[PDB]
């Protein structure tokens, strides 16, 4: 996985967990090239890649802070692509072998009760 | 995959759809040896499997046939691997992620209506 994406990865970790609040300060594009060993401008993709998914923001002269909303964008692509990874291939596979609604909600519960 | 499983199988799959009937008599060791050119004996493993598995059943001197309950274990077993290849790991990634019965229940839905 490119690093500039890894980079932003880490941080979404972060907010999502609580580790970094809204309107908190994060570590600018020099601080993580600096930290981790990085060129400033993959730091800065990652970064970038947030500012344009409306998850950090620049307050000019001071740094990068984290977006209000970025607790939800995040919530949201990650839901999406536990959904694509997990739901979909059930759910195609589900009709192409004409599984019911319910059938495929009892299957569930009683994979869940085989755990625990 | 072992072809006298590939050949058990592709049995299942002609009395799972229909093609072959409960009690109608099913080719033998011999006439699968024959047709597909396979080694008798590994025909006779498939059949043999489907014997110890309650799917088919000898008639002395005349051959084999497809057990009355074959049908129902099939779709049993079936179900069981469905489970374990499309279902578990939902489950086992779900309570990781902490997700509730009523979401997993409403992405299912969601992906299924973008599917149509």
Redesign the interface.
């Known amino acids: 996985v490119p690093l500039y994406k890894q980079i932003a990865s880490l941080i979404e970790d972060s907010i999502v967990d609580g580790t970094l609040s809204i309107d908190q300060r994060v570590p600018s594009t020099n601080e993580l090239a600096a930290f981790h060993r990085i060129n400033p401008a993959t730091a800065r993709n990652g970064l970038t890649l947030l500012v344009e998914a409306g998850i950090l923001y620049k307050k000019r002269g001071i740094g990068m802070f984290v977006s209000a909303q970025a607790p939800a964008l995040i919530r949201e692509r990650r839901?999406a692509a536990?959904?694509a990874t997990?739901?979909?291939?059930?759910?195609?596979?589900?009709?192409h072998?004409g599984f019911t609604?319910a059938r495929?909600?009892a299957?569930?519960?009683?994979?869940?009760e085989s755990?625990g």
Chains 1, 2 share one sequence.
């Open positions: 839901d536990f959904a997990y739901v979909a291939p059930l759910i195609d596979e589900s009709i072998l609604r495929i909600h299957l569930l519960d009683q994979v869940a755990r």
